[PDB]
């Protein structure tokens, strides 16, 4: 009845090695390994043999019908909707055996059927498959390609030769996708006919500190770290090692390491250079960081101390860069008075009050303090800003929020995807709507002409954005050089206009070189679209150009001598809107009077929001919500805990840092008492076993204070691993055990209610 007090007088386990529930399965996490594909096919064969004969073994062997069943019936990957079926032939036989002739293969093989060898080669079948996919003739009667260049490649022009399968799959009619293109050319081999792309290859997950994850196993959250390089990720190959490093600049590291990189906990002392992702001007010789390390950076909780300046920081770090809540102290008067020969008790009595009054508790964003540019009042201000709108807009946008939730709840998945596509396009058009209807013009004398603005551009896009980058408001980013303030020291005119004119010269030379190299190859033969237009992202211009030319006077003369860009029209939209008014019974005079009451009363939201529906995952905050006092106290408390655990890696016996940096009053090395069997000079009380208990501790009170503190920390470590069998009522473990027993009883009751419901339903 009591699960926590089962009788352990017989302990026995019945589990085999290898365990069949762990061995005979392919995991979903094993996607991206080709041997897993071979193993999945073999496991399907095992299941088929089990359901036929009760064992994982065939009666004779692998048959031909197992191969057909594996190729056709087992893997049945999902395609698009099938094309309209044809009932009559649209071609006629000209010579003999020109065409292939007009229950499944597996059950034909089961009922007696042999597979003998055909005489045609593989390239003929793949050519026929490509012709059926394109639905057009891809070779002529003489054997020469129609849609492909039939001359050998010009080696001096920079070209190489291509086979027809590569060309007719990489250049294809846009209603053929990559997977049926691979199927038509018989791309089958798991190891050599497949390559991973650069954007789709597997990588370890980034998890940061590792908090806030979804646990696959609720009792063991650490199992969710298994696909990452977190320091507590289970089984990372090589063990974490105790590293003691002296660098050539005399920076030293001591603590845990992963593949020789500081990546767990430890202590770094700074030499003439720098370390742990700190900037070069932050450190001096002999400064110290203690705490958490990830990938060589100070990352997590820690303490920075400088003896030279007296600065102490306790708090959070992100990538070596002082991010989050922190406490700052100035210990310089105490250190200064200690350096001039004052004993520490008298020095503390002189300096403690002035040190305590100057403690600072703050929020840091990225190496810099917050709270001087109104960061603590921004959220409230934005709330008040939403109250300064006219009432019609407020009522309308709240109604929009409710209606958007209601219609998203009722959508199909395909409707949901198309809705998000439309939202993305509306987000894009607020920065570049295009110039639809104003790319080309037809002036007098016919003569189609391009439409340019005052700076010669036919589009709003500029490709110098890819190098420098742009901001949220459309301003260009920082360059290679620059003044500190571009409003205090603007660029001198006569230089701005001279460089603008020379920039137009560069643009003209750009168009000339690109038209020389790429302007001759044809992408779309029906519209006259070429590679220079296509690869520059100007297909919109080409559709407008075809439409404008076909209605030009030269266009109609050429056409009878031989003999756009919008989904909806304005009139249809106005008709739909006018129809949609009269369903609700709203005349236009109702809109006139609502606009009258709106006119009589004459970035919308929280900037630090978490889940905005309209996002590009690109707009950055340059602040956070500032820490209150209890959060700062909690993180200082936890950081001191972390600093104690980090200082446990500080003197590796016979490590390099201890051998080189532990010195006497002169520069001479000392023999540290760290040897495991010898306790010299009356220090046998320090031994942790029974030999230490029978020896006398000296009568210095501060040493006994220190020993009591060390014993307290050891008991705190001990209680986390050793537990009582029968805990006394009134203790913490008794409370925990009572809650565990209650959890089992409640789950059993809920299970009994589902069994009652199942017996009621099945009747």
């Amino acid at each position: 009845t009591d699960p926590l007090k089962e009788d352990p007088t017989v302990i026995r386990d019945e589990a085999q090695f290898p365990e069949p529930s762990l061995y005979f399965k392919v995991f979903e996490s094993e996607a991206g390994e080709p041997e897993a594909k071979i193993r999945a096919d073999v496991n399907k064969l095992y299941d088929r043999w089990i359901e036929k004969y009760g064992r994982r073994w065939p009666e004779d062997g692998i048959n031909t019908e197992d191969m057909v069943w594996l190729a056709e019936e087992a893997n049945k990957r999902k395609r698009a909707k099938p094309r309209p079926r044809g009932t009559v032939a649209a071609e006629k036989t000209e010579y003999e055996d020109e065409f292939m002739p007009d229950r499944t293969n597996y059950e034909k093989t089961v009922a007696g059927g042999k597979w003998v060898t055909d005489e045609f080669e593989s390239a003929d079948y793949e050519a026929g498959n490509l012709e059926k996919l394109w639905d057009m003739y891809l070779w002529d009667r003489e054997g020469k390609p129609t849609m492909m260049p039939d001359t050998p490649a010009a080696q001096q022009e920079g070209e190489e030769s291509e086979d027809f399968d590569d060309f007719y799959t990489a250049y294809r009619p846009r209603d053929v996708d990559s997977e049926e293109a691979r199927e038509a050319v018989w791309a089958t081999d798991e190891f050599e006919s497949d390559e991973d792309n650069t954007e789709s290859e597997w990588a370890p997950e980034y998890v940061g500190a590792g908090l806030g994850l979804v646990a696959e196993d609720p009792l063991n959250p650490q199992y969710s770290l298994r696909h990452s390089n977190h320091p507590l990720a289970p089984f990372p190959g090589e063990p974490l090692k105790w590293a003691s490093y002296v660098y050539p600049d005399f920076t030293t590291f001591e603590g845990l390491s992963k593949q020789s990189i500081p990546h767990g906990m430890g202590v770094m002392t700074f030499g003439t250079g720098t370390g742990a992702g700190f900037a070069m001007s932050q450190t001096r010789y002999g400064d110290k960081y203690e705490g958490e390390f990830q990938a060589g950076y100070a990352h997590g909780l820690g303490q920075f101390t400088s003896e030279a300046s007296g600065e102490v920081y306790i708090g959070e770090f992100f990538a070596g860069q002082r991010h989050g809540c922190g406490m700052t102290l100035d210990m310089k008067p105490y250190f200064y008075l200690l350096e001039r020969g004052v004993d520490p008790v008298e020095a503390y009595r002189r300096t403690a009050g002035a040190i305590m009054k100057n403690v600072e508790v703050r929020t840091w964003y990225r190496g810099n303090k917050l709270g001087d540019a109104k960061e603590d009042e921004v959220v409230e201000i934005n709330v008040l800003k939403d109250e300064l709108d006219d009432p019609f807009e407020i009522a309308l946008r709240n109604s929009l929020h409710d209606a958007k939730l209601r219609k998203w709840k009722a959508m199909s998945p395909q409707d949901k995807a198309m809705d998000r596509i439309v939202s993305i396009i509306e987000r894009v058009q607020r920065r570049n709507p295009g110039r639809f209807g104003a790319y080309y013009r037809e002036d007098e004398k016919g003569r189609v002409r391009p439409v340019l603005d005052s700076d010669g551009a036919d589009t709003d896009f500029d490709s110098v954005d890819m190098i420098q980058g742009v901001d949220t408001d459309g301003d260009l980013g920082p360059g290679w050089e620059g003044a500190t303030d571009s409003e205090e020291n603007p660029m001198d005119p006569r230089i701005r206009e001279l460089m603008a004119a020379e920039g137009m010269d560069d643009k003209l030379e750009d168009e000339g070189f690109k038209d020389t190299v790429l302007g001759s190859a044809i992408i779309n033969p029906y519209t006259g679209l070429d590679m220079k237009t296509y690869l520059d992202g100007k297909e919109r211009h080409q559709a407008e150009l075809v439409s404008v030319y076909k209605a030009s006077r030269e266009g109609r003369k050429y056409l009878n001598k031989v003999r756009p860009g919008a989904l909806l029209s304005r009139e249809a939209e106005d008709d739909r809107l006018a129809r949609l008014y009269e369903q609700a019974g709203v005349s236009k005079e109702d809109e006139r009077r609502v606009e009258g009451l709106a006119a009589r009363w004459r970035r919308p939201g929280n900037p630090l929001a978490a889940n905005d529906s309209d996002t590009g995952f690109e707009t950055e905050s340059d602040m956070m919500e500032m820490c209150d006092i209890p959060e700062i106290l909690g993180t200082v408390q936890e950081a001191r805990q972390i600093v104690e655990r980090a200082r446990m890696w500080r003197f590796k016996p016979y490590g390099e840092v201890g051998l080189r940096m532990a010195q006497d009053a002169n520069g001479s090395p000392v023999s540290l008492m760290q040897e495991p069997l010898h306790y010299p000079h009356g220090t046998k009380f320090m031994a942790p076993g029974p030999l230490g208990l029978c020896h006398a501790v000296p009568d210095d009170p501060s040493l006994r204070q220190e020993m009591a503190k060390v014993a307290h920390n050891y008991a705190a470590i001990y209680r986390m691993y050793n537990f009582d069998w029968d805990p006394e009522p009134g203790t913490v473990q008794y409370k925990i055990d009572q809650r565990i027993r209650r959890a089992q009883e409640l789950r059993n009751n809920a299970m009994a209610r589902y069994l009652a419901a199942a017996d009621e339903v099945l009747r």
């Binding site: 365990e19 001990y718 006394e728 809650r739 209650r742 409640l746």
Partner: protein
């Protein structure tokens, strides 16, 4: 009336492991009086082949380990291969409660809570010499130092 009971038990399950919200069963009396007893000694263990192979795999991972321990001043002591650990155990310098570290661990643990360390240490000669040293050297010295001071 079962529906009221089921909703109350579901909301009880929702806050059961909230450690800051008190529960009526946290200090309830046990059914029998407490009389705090020890777990009985199991005296008979039959291992599965799974357990045998897991012990062998762990022994393979731990073959090349160099150990370290802490003393009563929280100072780490010297490089300890297995025979140095055996010498320190026999001499009484360390015991099963001493904090240790080796490869495979993130932090310092007592020796009894580190898997397979005590079976590696406790050779029959080691057990006999540890008993000799405890009985005839350290306990008379402990009684002498208790009487003398």
């Amino acid at each position: 009336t079962q529906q009221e009971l089921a909703q109350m038990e579901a909301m009880e399950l929702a806050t059961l492991f909230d450690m800051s919200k008190p529960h009526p069963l946290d200090n309830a009396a046990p059914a029998t009086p407490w009389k705090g007893e020890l777990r009985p000694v199991p005296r008979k263990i039959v291992l599965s082949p799974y357990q045998y192979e897991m012990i062998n795999y762990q022994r393979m991972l731990m073959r090349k380990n160099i150990w370290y321990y802490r003393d009563r001043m929280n100072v780490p002591r010297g490089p300890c291969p297995l025979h140095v650990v055996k010498e320190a155990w026999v001499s009484g310098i360390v015991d099963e409660n001493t904090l240790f570290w080796g490869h495979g661990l993130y932090d310092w643990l007592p020796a009894k809570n580190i898997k397979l360390l005590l079976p590696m240490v406790r050779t029959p000669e080691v057990r006999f010499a540890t008993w000799i040293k405890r009985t005839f050297s350290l306990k008379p010295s402990l009684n002498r130092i208790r009487e003398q001071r």
